Design a protein around this ligand. Structure first.
Ligand SMILES: CC#CCOc1ccc(CNS(N)(=O)=O)cc1
Ligand SMILES: CC#CCOc1ccc(CNS(N)(=O)=O)cc1
Ligand SMILES: [Zn+2]
Length: 260
């Protein structure tokens, strides 16, 4: 990806991605709009199992598109299982997509409603050995998506908000140990699920999406800080990191299943 030049601006944004990543117009692209009335309850869906008690965070990185909180995934320490999944999926990192305004920012939408942001906890299927091999498989990744709305602060998110000052620009990273991702989950684990893709290039169709119904609330001050990050590297013209979300894509031949 040393020669990639995609982003979220008018000249290299989502409408341009297909020229270098033709799968952008594929059969199972993400995100999608979740039409709550058309999604069907699926009694065969097992309960979701989120086991993050032994999670080991390591670092937080601004990669020029968003910021990732990375985890040690060399052992089964933080895994997602159950729900629509077969097997064990390991947490490798989480990041967010957000807007320039509270009225937009999420990638998935619910009955066309856009949330202020969306958290993505990325996990890979351990049967494939490593993340690089997993992204080459139809069932290689499981991404847990959680909507963020603006209201009360999310206590569990503050440590993230406070370290952003240290990774303002692209390429900067900072030690970020002992962060507990369980502090970012809503109370209920009710979800919608459908087969999809990574929402940024390479847009590989290797994701089982699990989107929680219940959003979490964050304060205006918390999301305000996200909006102070930069897409650019240090010493470059400042372009605020905002609206780093891909709009909803055609559902095509897919059905969204509800666990409730
Ligand atoms: C200065 C300068 C320059 C080059 O600008 C671009 C614009 C759009 C693109 C398209 N990238 S894509 N197809 O990955 O979104 C690439 C380079
Ligand atoms: C080849 C390859 C690769 C890895 O590239 C990515 C791209 C996006 C993401 C995050 N995807 S999302 N936004 O759908 O959770 C993770 C890894
Ligand atoms: Zn994402």
């Amino acid at each position: 990806g040393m020669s990639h030049h995609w982003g979220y601006g008018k000249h290299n944004g989502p409408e341009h991605w297909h020229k270098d990543f033709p799968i952008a117009k594929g059969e199972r692209q993400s995100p999608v709009d979740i039409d709550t009335h058309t999604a069907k309850y699926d009694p065969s869906l097992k309960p979701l199992s989120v086991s993050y008690d032994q999670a080991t965070s390591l670092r937080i990185l601004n990669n020029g598109h968003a910021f990732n909180v990375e985890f040690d995934d060399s052992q089964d320490k933080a895994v997602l299982k159950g729900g629509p999944l077969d097997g064990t999926y390991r947490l490798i990192q989480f990041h967010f997509h957000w807007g320039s305004l509270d009225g937009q920012g999420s990638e998935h939408t619910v009955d066309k409603k856009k949330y202020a942001a969306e958290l993505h906890l990325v996990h890979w299927n351990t049967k494939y050995g490593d993340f690089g091999k997993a992204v080459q498989q139809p069932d290689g990744l499981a991404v847990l998506g959680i909507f963020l709305k603006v209201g009360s602060a999310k206590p569990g998110l503050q440590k993230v908000v406070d370290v952003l000052d240290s990774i303002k620009t692209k390429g900067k990273s900072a030690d970020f140990t002992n962060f507990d991702p369980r502090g970012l989950l809503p109370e209920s684990l009710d979800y919608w699920t459908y087969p999809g893709s990574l929402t940024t290039p390479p847009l590989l169709e290797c994701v089982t999406w699990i989107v929680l119904k219940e959003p979490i609330s964050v304060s205006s001050e918390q999301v305000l800080k996200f909006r102070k990050l930069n897409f650019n590297g240090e010493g470059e013209p400042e372009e605020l990191m905002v609206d780093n979300w891909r709009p909803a894509q055609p559902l095509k031949n897919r059905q969204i299943k509800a666990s409730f």
